[PDB]
Amino acid sequence: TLPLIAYAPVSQNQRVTNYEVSGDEHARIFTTEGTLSPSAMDNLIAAAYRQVFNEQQMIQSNRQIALESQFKNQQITVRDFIRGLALSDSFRRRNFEVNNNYRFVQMCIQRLLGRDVYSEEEKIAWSIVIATKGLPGFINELLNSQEYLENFGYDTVPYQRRRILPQRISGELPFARMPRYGADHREKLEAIGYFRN
Amino acid sequence: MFDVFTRVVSQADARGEYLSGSQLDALSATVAEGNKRIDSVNRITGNASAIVSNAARALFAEQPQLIQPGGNAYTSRRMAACLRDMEIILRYVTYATFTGDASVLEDRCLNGLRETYVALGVPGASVAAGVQKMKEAALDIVNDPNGITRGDCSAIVAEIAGYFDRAAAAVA
Amino acid sequence: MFDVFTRVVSQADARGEYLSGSQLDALSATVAEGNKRIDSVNRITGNASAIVSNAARALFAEQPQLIQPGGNAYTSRRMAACLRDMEIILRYVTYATFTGDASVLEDRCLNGLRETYVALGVPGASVAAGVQKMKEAALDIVNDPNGITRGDCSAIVAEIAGYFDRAAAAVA
Amino acid sequence: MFDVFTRVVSQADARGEYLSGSQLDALSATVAEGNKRIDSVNRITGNASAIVSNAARALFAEQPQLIQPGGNAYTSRRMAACLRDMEIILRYVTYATFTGDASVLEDRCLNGLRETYVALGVPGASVAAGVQKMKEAALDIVNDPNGITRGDCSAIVAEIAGYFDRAAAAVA
Amino acid sequence: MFDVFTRVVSQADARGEYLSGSQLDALSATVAEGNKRIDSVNRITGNASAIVSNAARALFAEQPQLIQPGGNAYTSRRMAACLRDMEIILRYVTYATFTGDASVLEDRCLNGLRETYVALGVPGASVAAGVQKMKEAALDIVNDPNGITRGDCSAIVAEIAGYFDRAAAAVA
Amino acid sequence: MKTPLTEAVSTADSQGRFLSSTELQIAFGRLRQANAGLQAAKALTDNAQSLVNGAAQAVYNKFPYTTQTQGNNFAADQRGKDKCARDIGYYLRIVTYCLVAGGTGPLDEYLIAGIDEINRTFDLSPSWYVEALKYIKANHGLSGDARDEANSYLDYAINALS
Amino acid sequence: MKTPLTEAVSTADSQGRFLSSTELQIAFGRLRQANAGLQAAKALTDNAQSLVNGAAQAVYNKFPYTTQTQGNNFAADQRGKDKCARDIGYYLRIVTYCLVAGGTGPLDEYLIAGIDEINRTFDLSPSWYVEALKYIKANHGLSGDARDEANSYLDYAINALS
Amino acid sequence: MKTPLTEAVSTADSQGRFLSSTELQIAFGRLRQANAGLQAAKALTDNAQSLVNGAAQAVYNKFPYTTQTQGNNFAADQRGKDKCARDIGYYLRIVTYCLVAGGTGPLDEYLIAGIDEINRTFDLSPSWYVEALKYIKANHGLSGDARDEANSYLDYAINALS
Amino acid sequence: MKTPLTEAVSTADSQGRFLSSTELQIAFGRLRQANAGLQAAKALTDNAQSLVNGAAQAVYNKFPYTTQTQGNNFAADQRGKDKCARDIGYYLRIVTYCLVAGGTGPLDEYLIAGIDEINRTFDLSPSWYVEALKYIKANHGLSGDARDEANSYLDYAINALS
């Protein structure tokens, strides 16, 4: 293949060292390294669903039943479960098909690496990783990324990182806010005949 | 996020001063109506599914273009997402009621939700109308005199009404 | 990124031609400058903690409103974050001095720092003044004539000062 | 995880039976002992750093062959990891004391810890000795009559001793 | 991970002693041999593709069972993996030659290589034979008199041969 | 499960911290209402047979088609009535478990997780179980601290079924 | 900031569910502790100036080298004594904030975060502030639930520095 | 882009630390090799026209079918010969840029990455460019540290093509 | 541990590539500093006992309260002075290890990582070790390249302790 085109990092809160006690506005570690009850495993699976699919696509049709069953049996790690959520049909249709490669790179970087994209250049750099290697190649690149590892490793549900600074009511906007599709797919659905009154 | 205590702590630390007697008496008053606060949270939590279902039903009764083919709530999936949005907004109003401060509501629910509903094509006026219908449903449920110890509860009802109006104004 | 060698290499590839004799003579002058450059990098690295501490102390002496309550260097978290910001800016100034070109300083440090400081409410003028205090601190450490071989080091001192003003202009 | 209530709840659900009056009386006795349990948790938490420091000092006094070079607690990284391990094991003992059951201690701390220590070459007998020193420190601090209302607290002390013995038996 | 100095540092610190004069003189002799070490690394790196291709051709001329269908090196995916393993083993032998210690080779290449080859059904003796062919090619290329200034290079070449023998013994 | 002690410990473990005064107050509220939860669970245990029989009769009164139409999922025969009484006994026993435990954790581990696939697979309407839980609300007889603690678990199972 | 209420919400938010009776018991423990915390903070606010001066004098008593050795980090001159009095004032004020909040959250987001690199780049010994907190723990004069819940914050900052 | 200074700064930034004496030794090795690299770059610069013409002649001698058989990928006509000479000049120029840069970074960013797709798409045999780089190795006339540094870049491009 | 050879091999493994001329130049800089590092480590080894005793004594002159105030963390007894001399021997020995290895990797893996927990847990002030390493800076007795390399390790430990 080809090496990724270089992009400059833009200063974000996750780049600097965190001088905080976790406390109130810490994202809870959903980890399988400690032995869990089936209830706690269910909340961990729901946390992975809430991170990848958001709250809206937590419906029964979007539940990956065999992936959940293999994850309970520890056939796969948390990272492989996150990969299976990203490789899910529902994720591909709802999120990937309704977006271009740029906004899908932004969505996947936010929902897997836990940080925003630095600029449009990072979206440009990983969009050709999408365009050549498919969605599986791109997700695999993101999940094998040292960033994903040094932050979440193999056995932790990813979370938005450093969303809010200590003693701040408000920080960066939450990743949940980002929609399945942008305004381009909105106006394309408006043009095909939807959403009118 | 802040609550009714940590907010006042935050302005005190911004000014770099200890709390006065009046601030501690106001916080003791919030402790005094804390029991009615927990009752309000318990009642909305217990009737959350009924509130979401009834308010969605009334909203799509008055606004039939959402359930008409082509509408923003026009599928099983989009209706499930709209009911999930109702549940989420109700959940964050209960979080703000529990804390006594809407910092969690403004932080994790409301900031950026208007641009999200614009980018989706979600009609924010219809979401504001549904949130308002949740406001009358939740306020009628909270103010129920049956099966509870009687007392004045207009402060916590007005606080819930303010949280609901702030949630409706964030999407309208 | 680029250094003093690869910047000229990239510009020569942009023109698509071999390096002329004048460019190679200038790069050989950089080779003659390299030992003094390594000395300057080693001196700022070895006195980095003292430079950061003394620059912070003199900055909060000149600007007492930062450490007063309601200030940006107030509380221990923001104070440690401010000292970390001084250490990071000094670290990438040493990186740019080591390379001989400020590609790492713009691309990996100063990219997006100004609007980050705008969004957090960080006063960029005070950070620029702290970077200036780091600049005279590092120039006093570099131009110390004791314990080193005598020689003229005006070009490397001017390059360090230019890198420091380039760091300070990216936040003010 | 389990606490003292959900252990009995899980046993009753595995039987598929309502809880008998002996179980309700035992859990009411647990509720009666709960204030002493919270006092024990608070005392060990408030003296956690003193417990870890004094237990490490006494451990590497009576076993000085680990801080001498070539030892397992030799070097800053290794010794910091040893102090952190003592703090972690003490923290999970406080967790098990808080829940009234050793489910969190066995499943999130003691599971694989002997395997981890024999994989890293950590001598688990020395860690067990340090766990006994944290045991004697914590049961001395908990049983202190000063600054607390006098009462019989031997069941909580024996339960903390049981959790410490479980921690000591699971590292070697 | 160690190099030729770092191994002596780790052994002396595990003994908790300063390096004796014999160890310092041995490391000085290693620094004297370092130019020949860099020459050996540069020659094997510059002829790596020739070494891998010629060693593969000699291996599959000696062992035509691998390239016939039903064989391990049959098909372009498995042969591409085989040539990748040849250049990976050659790369970590050059890494070990560069460092002067085999910690990178036994820790970053041969870690789990035999378990991988047995689990895959890869013939480890065939990989060992290919490693011996790379050894013969590399000690032919390094010992070439032409194009380099003359000198005695018995020790570095014996060290390279020891690296190749411990690469072949770790897969056999 | 989800109880104040277990959730406080899991939160403090995730943030990697000791049990501060926050978790002590969590256990304080647990101790404050644990006695009322235990005696509510005892009252429901003693009145459980009458509560389950009355709840089954109330479901058959609201939904008579269960007791007159043929089907595996209906209570027309004696086997279906035994299944409905067993189901309402399951619901009430997990309510007593939640009253003992102090949270909806016994419901989340024993009843809530997987009830939708059962209700759609065995063709059981969740509104029947909602009506049974409403009868348990209307006829448990608890007052004050016990009533609001019990009806929290009753309503949590109602909102999970609706 | 870490506080029963905020922590209860954070748990319900991460699991994406409503505030169960677990969360309500967390609020109940917050309510029963909050009046004692507010009266403790009122007493410490009243005794604040004497406690800060006595704690600074106790640090000067146990560590006299701070009052005789010249340096930026020492209290030999008037500016060092002013910075020290401001430091114990900050400590006692954030302890009162923790009392009002009912958790260690004001200490976590105001003082404990980044105190270690502050103490090492300004060459401040944490044992000075430990002895100041020992004076606050010895001379605050509270009794009962106000004493133990105030001391839990003082030993929390002691264990953070040590 | 691999250069001793850029890789040292990248390593120090990836670990987030200052430039210790290790990166100083990296810069010292760069600085020691730099004069030989610049002299080698100047010699290849002012001998480059003869080197490129001779390398094209050596490729046409070893592979005469490039000059005889028709095709867009072959040098049978004038434009194929001009494109071959321009490609060999590109190879030699990026080798000189590697000599100035003191690492294989110009080769990676400019010539090595994606050369397989160019050779695949336009049907160019890499053995032609290998023979051209062997001509550059045989007759660039350098000795000592300048020869060993220049031949390392020529062998790096040969290793990437073969 | 972090040495120029280890950083070069780890980088070439990080991009998964052979040792180019960049890593060779890293090795040449390591070789050109390694001799002066070896006589620097030899001179520090020969002067080790005098330097450790003088550094401990200079700590006792700048910080006399360590020899006067009774405590576990102080050198008032013979046990505390033995621990201090052992610590300064550890510091100087790891400095000689850094001189032998050619980088601060021995300092990182043996001394720098985790030293913050060491000074907070056992109540050791880093200013004592800063003064002792300043004494080692004062009269280690090296000149030229050995002086600049050894002091860079002494400043690396000083900046990590401050």
Ligand SMILES: *[C@H](C)[C@H]1/C(=C/c2[nH]c(/C=C3N=C(/C=C4\NC(=O)C(CC)=C4C)C(C)=C\3CCC(=O)O)c(CCC(=O)O)c2C)NC(=O)[C@@H]1C
């Ligand atoms: C029903 C006939 C019987 C029964 C079943 C039962 N199964 C489980 C748990 C698991 N079953 C599987 C099997 C698979 N998961 C997969 O992905 C695949 C292929 C794609 C298979 C074949 C697994 C992995 C589990 C564990 C993970 C999970 O729980 O989902 C249980 C739960 C046991 C428990 O207590 O945890 C049960 C009850 N039980 C019976 O009694 C019937 C005979």
Ligand SMILES: *[C@H](C)[C@H]1/C(=C/c2[nH]c(/C=C3N=C(/C=C4\NC(=O)C(CC)=C4C)C(C)=C\3CCC(=O)O)c(CCC(=O)O)c2C)NC(=O)[C@@H]1C
């Ligand atoms: C007193 C017990 C001893 C003493 C103290 C001393 N402290 C400083 C400087 C600082 N102290 C802090 C601490 C905080 N800042 C905060 O925002 C908070 C949370 C609200 C805390 C706890 C900080 C940030 C500084 C440095 C910035 C500043 O000057 O304000 C000094 C001065 C150090 C200097 O170099 O200028 C001193 C002297 N000194 C003693 O001798 C006493 C034993």
Ligand SMILES: *[C@H](C)[C@H]1/C(=C/c2[nH]c(/C=C3N=C(/C=C4\NC(=O)C(CC)=C4C)C(C)=C\3CCC(=O)O)c(CCC(=O)O)c2C)NC(=O)[C@@H]1C
């Ligand atoms: C001397 C300058 C002053 C002094 C020192 C003192 N140190 C300790 C205790 C420890 N020192 C270390 C340091 C290291 N351990 C290592 O493995 C390494 C890397 C090789 C270093 C740098 C450690 C780990 C300890 C504690 C464990 C132990 O006791 O060995 C003490 C004792 C503290 C105690 O509480 O027992 C003392 C007194 N004290 C002074 O007054 C001098 C000014």
Ligand SMILES: CCC1=C(C)/C(=C/C2=NC(=C\c3[nH]c(/C=C4\NC(=O)[C@H](C)[C@H]4CC)c(C)c3CCC(=O)O)/C(CCC(=O)O)=C2C)NC1=O
């Ligand atoms: C690696 C390049 C890079 C840098 C440098 C950077 C800076 C940076 N400084 C921050 C905050 C900060 N920055 C400062 C700095 C100062 N306050 C003052 O009053 C002084 C004028 C000044 C120091 C001289 C402070 C106090 C904060 C705290 C923000 C807060 O918590 O409110 C934050 C928010 C994230 C966090 O604090 O965890 C970032 C990202 N981000 C990057 O990616």
Ligand SMILES: CCC1=C(C)/C(=C/C2=NC(=C\c3[nH]c(/C=C4\NC(=O)[C@H](C)[C@H]4CC)c(C)c3CCC(=O)O)/C(CCC(=O)O)=C2C)NC1=O
């Ligand atoms: C936690 C705070 C928060 C909220 C609440 C939020 C809302 C939210 N509502 C969405 C969709 C939606 N929201 C609605 C809601 C409605 N549609 C209607 O017609 C009604 C007016 C209304 C019901 C009241 C619908 C129907 C969708 C589906 C849009 C779609 O998927 O096509 C989406 C995108 C769905 C996705 O990405 O999978 C978000 C993020 N985002 C946040 O961060």
Ligand SMILES: CCC1=C(C)/C(=C/C2=NC(=C\c3[nH]c(/C=C4\NC(=O)[C@H](C)[C@H]4CC)c(C)c3CCC(=O)O)/C(CCC(=O)O)=C2C)NC1=O
């Ligand atoms: C864990 C489940 C649980 C909950 C939720 C609970 C709440 C609770 N609410 C109370 C009081 C109360 N609750 C209310 C609330 C109201 N009064 C009204 O007429 C309005 C309709 C309504 C506002 C929604 C009032 C006025 C009091 C008495 C004042 C007070 O105690 O604060 C009390 C004091 C004891 C009592 O008199 O009953 C408790 C314990 N106890 C529990 O065990």
Ligand SMILES: CCC1=C(C)/C(=C/C2=NC(=C\c3[nH]c(/C=C4\NC(=O)[C@H](C)[C@H]4CC)c(C)c3CCC(=O)O)/C(CCC(=O)O)=C2C)NC1=O
């Ligand atoms: C690995 C640690 C290490 C370093 C950093 C190092 C640097 C170093 N700096 C040198 C020279 C030098 N350094 C300077 C620098 C200066 N002269 C001044 O009066 C100014 C105050 C100052 C500018 C900051 C000069 C002028 C020379 C001699 C000219 C030259 O060699 O380039 C030399 C040549 C040998 C010598 O004469 O000392 C070396 C080796 N050697 C090492 O082993």
Ligand SMILES: CCC1=C(C)/C(=C/C2=NC(=C\c3[nH]c(/C=C4\NC(=O)[C@H](C)[C@H]4CC)c(C)c3CCC(=O)O)/C(CCC(=O)O)=C2C)NC1=O
């Ligand atoms: C949030 C911080 C906080 C805590 C932790 C707390 C604990 C606490 N412990 C109590 C009692 C008690 N604590 C003990 C404990 C002991 N008695 C002993 O002599 C042994 C040395 C020791 C075992 C470690 C006993 C015996 C009681 C009285 C019996 C009981 O109330 O359960 C009480 C009842 C009120 C009182 O009489 O003081 C409280 C509130 N209150 C608070 O506000």
Ligand SMILES: CCC1=C(C)/C(=C/C2=NC(=C\c3[nH]c(/C=C4\NC(=O)[C@H](C)[C@H]4CC)c(C)c3CCC(=O)O)/C(CCC(=O)O)=C2C)NC1=O
């Ligand atoms: C089943 C998938 C598969 C393929 C495709 C495959 C190809 C393949 N062809 C090879 C060699 C070869 N292929 C040729 C082919 C030719 N030489 C010419 O002049 C002709 C124009 C041309 C025929 C069209 C030659 C001469 C070699 C020997 C190369 C050598 O020994 O150096 C080799 C080297 C190993 C060996 O000697 O067997 C492989 C792996 N192997 C596989 O497992």
Ligand SMILES: CCC1=C(C)/C(=C/C2=NC(=C\c3[nH]c(/C=C4\NC(=O)[C@H](C)[C@H]4CC)c(C)c3CCC(=O)O)/C(CCC(=O)O)=C2C)NC1=O
């Ligand atoms: C950490 C360093 C490292 C090592 C040590 C390594 C070895 C390695 N060799 C592999 C496969 C392989 N290796 C060979 C090698 C050979 N087959 C033969 O017949 C010959 C005897 C021999 C070459 C001389 C083959 C054929 C496969 C593929 C086996 C298969 O596809 O089933 C695989 C399986 C995954 C893959 O194909 O990429 C690994 C991991 N990979 C690494 O990154």
Ligand SMILES: CCC1=C(C)/C(=C/C2=NC(=C\c3[nH]c(/C=C4\NC(=O)[C@H](C)[C@H]4CC)c(C)c3CCC(=O)O)/C(CCC(=O)O)=C2C)NC1=O
């Ligand atoms: C960056 C690329 C680069 C490299 C790699 C390099 C290596 C290099 N090898 C050298 C010496 C040498 N190299 C050898 C090596 C050998 N002699 C033999 O006859 C054996 C065939 C062979 C072992 C493989 C010897 C014996 C010396 C002289 C002794 C010494 O300098 O150590 C020298 C000293 C200068 C000289 O006399 O040429 C250098 C600079 N210089 C560079 O610029």
